[PDB]
């Protein structure tokens, strides 16, 4: 049974270590999700197109180093 | 518009960062949701007990120090 959801990950696993001390294993499915929003419809195309290159490699030192 | 979504937060804020750096400023809706699961349905008052008692002070010493 899925007992709550919490917004804040530390705070739904401090309530999940606490329980373990009292013997009651809980688990967590955390889903993560970051919507990345432009407001300048203009500059679509552009961002898509940068999207695709950092995309094939997000690790790229062009990221890291920005 | 909504341009896409990444799971990890870090990788989103790369993108935004490096854009940033382009001239175009995105911006995150981070939508954060840790569910809590119990596999053993005879915890679940136990657990629901305490819940209570957590979302009352969720930083209270008995949490933070377990």
Do not use: C, K
Not at 25 to 37: A, G
């Amino acid at each position: 049974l899925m007992i709550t959801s919490f917004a804040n990950p530390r705070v739904a696993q401090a309530f999940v270590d606490y329980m373990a001390t009292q013997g009651v294993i809980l688990t967590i499915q955390q889903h993560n999700q970051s919507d990345v929003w432009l407001a300048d419809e203009s500059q679509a195309e552009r961002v898509r197109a940068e999207l695709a290159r950092f995309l094939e490699n997000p690790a790229d030192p062009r990221y890291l180093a920005a």
